[PDB]
Amino acid sequence: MSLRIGVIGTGAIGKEHINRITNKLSGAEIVAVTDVNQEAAQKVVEQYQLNATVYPNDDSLLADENVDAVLVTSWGPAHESSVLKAIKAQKYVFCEVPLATTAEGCMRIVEEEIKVGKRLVQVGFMRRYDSGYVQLKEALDNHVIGEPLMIHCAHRNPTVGDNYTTDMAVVDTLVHEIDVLHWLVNDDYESVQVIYPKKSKNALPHLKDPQIVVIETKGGIVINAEIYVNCKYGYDIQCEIVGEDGIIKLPEPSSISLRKEGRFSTDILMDWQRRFVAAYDVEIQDFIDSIQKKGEVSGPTAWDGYIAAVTTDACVKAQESGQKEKVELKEKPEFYQ
Amino acid sequence: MSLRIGVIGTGAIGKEHINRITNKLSGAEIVAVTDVNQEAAQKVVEQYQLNATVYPNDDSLLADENVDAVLVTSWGPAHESSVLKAIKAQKYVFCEVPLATTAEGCMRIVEEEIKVGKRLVQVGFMRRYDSGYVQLKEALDNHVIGEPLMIHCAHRNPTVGDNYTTDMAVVDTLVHEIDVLHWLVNDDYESVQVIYPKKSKNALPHLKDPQIVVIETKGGIVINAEIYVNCKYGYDIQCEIVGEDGIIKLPEPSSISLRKEGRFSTDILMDWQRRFVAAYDVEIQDFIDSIQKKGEVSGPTAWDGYIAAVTTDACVKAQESGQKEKVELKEKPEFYQ
Amino acid sequence: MSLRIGVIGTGAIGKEHINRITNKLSGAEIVAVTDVNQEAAQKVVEQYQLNATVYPNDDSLLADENVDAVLVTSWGPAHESSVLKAIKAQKYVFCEVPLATTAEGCMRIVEEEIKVGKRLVQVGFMRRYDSGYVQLKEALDNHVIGEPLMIHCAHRNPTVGDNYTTDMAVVDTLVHEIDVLHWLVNDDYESVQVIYPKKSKNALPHLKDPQIVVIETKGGIVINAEIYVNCKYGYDIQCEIVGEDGIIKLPEPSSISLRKEGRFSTDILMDWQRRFVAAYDVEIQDFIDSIQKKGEVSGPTAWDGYIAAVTTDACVKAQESGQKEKVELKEKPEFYQ
Amino acid sequence: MSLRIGVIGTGAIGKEHINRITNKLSGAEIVAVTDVNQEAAQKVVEQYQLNATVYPNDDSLLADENVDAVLVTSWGPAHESSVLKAIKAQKYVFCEVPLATTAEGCMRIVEEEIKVGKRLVQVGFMRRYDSGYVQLKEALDNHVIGEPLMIHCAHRNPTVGDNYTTDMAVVDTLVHEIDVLHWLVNDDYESVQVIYPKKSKNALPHLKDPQIVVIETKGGIVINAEIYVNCKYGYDIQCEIVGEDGIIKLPEPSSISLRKEGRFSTDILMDWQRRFVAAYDVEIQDFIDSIQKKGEVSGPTAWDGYIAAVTTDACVKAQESGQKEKVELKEKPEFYQ
Numbered sequence A, B, C, D: 001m002s003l004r005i006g007v008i009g010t011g012a013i014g015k016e017h018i019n020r021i022t023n024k025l026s027g028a029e030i031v032a033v034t035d036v037n038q039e040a041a042q043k044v045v046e047q048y049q050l051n052a053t054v055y056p057n058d059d060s061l062l063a064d065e066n067v068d069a070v071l072v073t074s075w076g077p078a079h080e081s082s083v084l085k086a087i088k089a090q091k092y093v094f095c096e097v098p099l100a101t102t103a104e105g106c107m108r109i110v111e112e113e114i115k116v117g118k119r120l121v122q123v124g125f126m127r128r129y130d131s132g133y134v135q136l137k138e139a140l141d142n143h144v145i146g147e148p149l150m151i152h153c154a155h156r157n158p159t160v161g162d163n164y165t166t167d168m169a170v171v172d173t174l175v176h177e178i179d180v181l182h183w184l185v186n187d188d189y190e191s192v193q194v195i196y197p198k199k200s201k202n203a204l205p206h207l208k209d210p211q212i213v214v215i216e217t218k219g220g221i222v223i224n225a226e227i228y229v230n231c232k233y234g235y236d237i238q239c240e241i242v243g244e245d246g247i248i249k250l251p252e253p254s255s256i257s258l259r260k261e262g263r264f265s266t267d268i269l270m271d272w273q274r275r276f277v278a279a280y281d282v283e284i285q286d287f288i289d290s291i292q293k294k295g296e297v298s299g300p301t302a303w304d305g306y307i308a309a310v311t312t313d314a315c316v317k318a319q320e321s322g323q324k325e326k327v328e329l330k331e332k333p334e335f336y337q
């Protein structure tokens, strides 16, 4: 007997989630969708031969008693609104990054979930389900390299559109690093600082590219993260953790090697979409499985969404301040441990 | 509306397939099982909370009109029998390696499928679905390295039981290499030769370990394959294809690197089961998807099973002959292209 | 007819240079030595069966008309003194790092060389002769990756003695990085900043280990350099240069790979001495060759020594300031380009 | 007091040896040369400003009492002649591969050295001095992987001239593999077999390219060696040794990695000359050093030359026989152990 899922926002990524749930995962179906372009959400129901109702807005869909759970996968700032409603309507919500665009927005959502007794909210930080990052986690949990002291990491992308703005680099992009990193090391951010290198010839005039972002935790781990979204060569995620007694490092995506015209090579991806395909699948399936076999959700929490929001804010602050901004977090409610 | 699958042989591997279909894949269910230890097949229905009928034998299960398709995943020599029945009962059959234990056994099965008009039989040669081997295929199809001339490859395993016999090395083990290799290069085997190196201290007395197996295709590709099932260090599959203008090579499984006590390392698997987990999933899902969206099966064919059987036989021949045995194949029926 | 070399300071490293010149290189001999422990200098002349005069002090040795060139390889702060003397005595001087321990000390030496018409002083920054760094140089000179924007690099060492102090990390250690990096990118340092991560359990109480050192050039290249001298795992130099259109990276030292007990590994060196052995050889041979076939020295210059001194000072400043210190350099005299 | 060396054969490779001895190594000089084109030998003496006598033939040069040692570096079949003379004239001889072009030719040379009491003859098999091969040796000597069982290896070259003939592949090319491999594993060859794969489009019509060469030792190690001299992509030497409990593998030559246009790459050499440059240097220096500090030569022996000759012959035999030829070696004289 399969979980009945309603999708809010049938854009490019909500279309990807509809396809995995329909044709790749196990034990769930899409019974309802609503988009803001109601005509698009009516061409998607046909496209994937869904057996689903098409609502004009969220409220209508959240009223429907079929739907046990919703995917929030619409425009970014329209998230907070739909999550609060779904919590009050007491449905399970899988909400794509970001949880909300402001730090208080995330706080409002925590307070609601806190009331409604159990965990309803999983945030779509898929990196925690990628086998690379899972292995790093395992080695750290095993004290393979003793105490983490520094982290170097990088998030690069071939080119961006006319729409990509200086803040998006730390809000839409460095956001997964921010989530995954503190999950691995089990610590909280303290300060953030932003440093701009010589600007790239591949960056448009309004964009500042690359950027380095230093970040210290409370324990004193020092992270420096490079964000270069016009690197031209490929899409590439690198993460090295230096510990007291050794170093561990994230793998490249699997690739056949080639020997030809003087070079020994492997392939680098050009498409951010392709990089985490497996972790999307495993993440959703875990929302599904965790609900039917526990009565609550298991992944990244509303709280983790809140931590991403505060730090993301401090970054955008140190971004035009040029100074060493501070990251101030409220006490972690007993609810979340 | 999901495909109704009956499993013949609820052993260790048929249990793995029941679990992927039940809890990982999409659009199919297990409605029927039969084992030879009928008590075991009645503890498996409970184990995975299946909603399935338990038959005493294949015939009973193949009569059941629920079941559209069957997994043949029982003892090895009990395959041919169950496949012929399922073809005549006109159900879709996914049959695990081997198709049958004798070369004529595979021929009998081809003749039956040939009659019944369309493709019912997929053979479980999962390597063709592994992303490594898929990439090699893609580069060869693109003429990246021109004409294949030689292949070097290796199939190693830490240790084997008291049950592992000299012939099993080319019958149960080198069998996937044999299937996958000719699929990649699109050619047929001509001769096989077997050469025994100094015998390993890790091999039991009745077993001959390692072995090298040279194999020539009709076009003149020269393959040498190493089979060392007591290599102790790990489970490891290596495949290098040398072409006219360059070389392509299979990847290692993804692993975090580590720097500690004087060494820079990655992990090697110890468990053959873990190596191809993803290709099992993708293989089954493709049996499922290909049936509901085409009315026939798509994978490795009954014919490919026949090619594996002939070559596997010539190998066991050159295995105790010590001579350069021959591989003689019947004409490839128009049915299969 | 071979170059006659006098060695000032017959310690451990001056002994290594006497051995290479005597038994490995071409076209030079040691005809004179002086140490501060004059007894040790005699034991050296005997040890390497030298045919050399033993002076009580530098002045005596610089008077000797045999010696065309001197190695300054004595205790650190005793360098400046011996280099000024050798310049005025008008001999060729190869001076090991540092050129002098203060920034003005290097300035005094530049002024002397400036007068004496030609280049007499090569500083022993051997990295410029290592084949790795030579290749990076070549790729940058060829615009392979366009404009350098950032550099990440690391200098790690297993453990240090009771004698290793917090400033030595940027004075004795990060000093080669400081020389080589601006040689590669052809730019000058502007600011330096020092950040202390959580302190290591492998570091003694008086030592601050690791450190991160951020450094910006005038053009805007942003360098972050990690110095971890108690990393325990090995001796390891890493340098990655991120450019506009691609990334280039320093190689590991050559090593046989090994597959054993679950791991695929290569070796990491435990001894800083072993890492640059080939660049020492090539460096000295180039002092020799460049003198006999040009009448002047070719390597890193007295000026480059001065640049290392100013930046080294700013680092030690930002080291206890905790602030973003500045690097102020005098105009580059026409003499040096 | 430096070793006085006479060079027989001032061709391209004898010119390289004259240059290293003159301008790179320590403790030796060229005091005498003779070529067959006596005019070329004069132009060489001038080219490298040598202080040397120019003889019309070997006999004259071997009479000269200056010369303690000779390099035999002339045209291939002219080696045996000059080595026998030098042994009887009782000079030290460094003889480039091959020692002689026939197996009995090597036998005549062994018998002469055997009489003259000590070791005069070093054969120029430089691989034993390359740091890669030295490391493999060390790991095998340490039983790191237990008992060697198989070896896979390859010798590839971009393209060859109109002058390169099918036999040269096993006589001029596979000859270093043949020497180095039995040195590593400390065993003797027993059989050889030659297998021709589909012929390459890069090979001329008179040449058979690639070839595989299987070789068994007495102990039962099974070696398969690939020789592809028109592989087009680069010059590339690969050697993998599979032992009982693990695998060891030769390194690639050091290279900077690059990330650009979709690929992560390293460089492959195009010039056989560049691959072993360091082992040539270390090899010669060891002829020199071993003579002045022992009164005999240390490297590969006249005997090792003989072993290469017998096996080289068996290969050329199995090369047009198509059969499994045999390698028959005379008893190893007590003189050589």
Ligand SMILES: NC(=O)c1ccc[n+]([C@@H]2O[C@H](COP(=O)([O-])OP(=O)(O)OC[C@H]3O[C@@H](n4cnc5c(N)ncnc54)[C@H](O)[C@@H]3O)[C@@H](O)[C@H]2O)c1
Pocket (backbone or CB within 6 Å): A008, A009, A010, A011, A012, A013, A014, A034, A035, A036, A037, A040, A057, A058, A073, A074, A075, A076, A077, A078, A082, A096, A097, A098, A124, A125, A126, A172
């Ligand atoms: N975790 C990740 O790596 C990742 C990757 C990509 C995108 N995302 C996130 O996914 C979201 C969507 O991404 P996208 O690039 O497909 O954007 P998109 O523009 O394709 O999706 C927005 C769609 O939702 C509709 N919409 C907006 N508000 C709505 C509302 N309140 N109710 C119903 N429909 C509404 C719009 O009409 C549009 O069709 C964003 O929040 C983005 O940050 C996360």
Ligand SMILES: NC(=O)c1ccc[n+]([C@@H]2O[C@H](COP(=O)([O-])OP(=O)(O)OC[C@H]3O[C@@H](n4cnc5c(N)ncnc54)[C@H](O)[C@@H]3O)[C@@H](O)[C@H]2O)c1
Pocket (backbone or CB within 6 Å): B008, B009, B010, B011, B012, B013, B014, B034, B035, B036, B037, B040, B057, B058, B073, B074, B075, B076, B077, B078, B082, B096, B097, B098, B124, B125, B126, B172
């Ligand atoms: N493609 C691969 O990499 C791969 C891997 C592992 C196993 N296999 C194949 O899978 C098959 C099973 O493997 P396994 O190791 O789990 O063996 P297993 O012993 O666990 O499975 C045999 C089971 O089937 C039952 N059985 C035998 N004949 C039967 C019949 N006619 N009808 C109903 N039940 C029957 C037995 O009682 C037993 O429970 C073998 O043929 C093997 O070659 C293939």
Ligand SMILES: NC(=O)c1ccc[n+]([C@@H]2O[C@H](COP(=O)([O-])OP(=O)(O)OC[C@H]3O[C@@H](n4cnc5c(N)ncnc54)[C@H](O)[C@@H]3O)[C@@H](O)[C@H]2O)c1
Pocket (backbone or CB within 6 Å): C008, C009, C010, C011, C012, C013, C014, C015, C034, C035, C036, C037, C040, C058, C073, C074, C075, C076, C077, C078, C082, C096, C097, C098, C124, C125, C126, C172
């Ligand atoms: N470039 C490099 O990779 C590198 C590596 C190691 C050391 N060094 C540098 O080289 C220098 C020498 O190192 P070391 O380890 O041989 O030193 P050391 O302490 O081992 O010995 C130096 C010797 O010179 C003597 N000496 C001191 N002052 C003298 C003077 N005025 N005149 C003559 N002799 C004098 C000392 O008594 C001692 O015997 C140091 O400055 C060091 O920092 C450079």
Ligand SMILES: NC(=O)c1ccc[n+]([C@@H]2O[C@H](COP(=O)([O-])OP(=O)(O)OC[C@H]3O[C@@H](n4cnc5c(N)ncnc54)[C@H](O)[C@@H]3O)[C@@H](O)[C@H]2O)c1
Pocket (backbone or CB within 6 Å): D008, D009, D010, D011, D012, D013, D014, D015, D034, D035, D036, D037, D040, D058, D073, D074, D075, D076, D077, D078, D082, D096, D097, D098, D124, D125, D126, D172
């Ligand atoms: N070990 C290695 O890596 C390696 C590499 C290249 C070549 N070699 C070998 O070294 C040898 C020389 O190679 P090369 O390319 O310099 O040869 P080359 O043909 O370029 O020149 C050899 C020179 O010696 C002269 N010569 C011939 N016979 C002579 C004799 N009896 N006495 C004096 N001079 C004589 C020739 O006229 C010529 O000028 C060859 O046997 C070759 O196979 C070994």
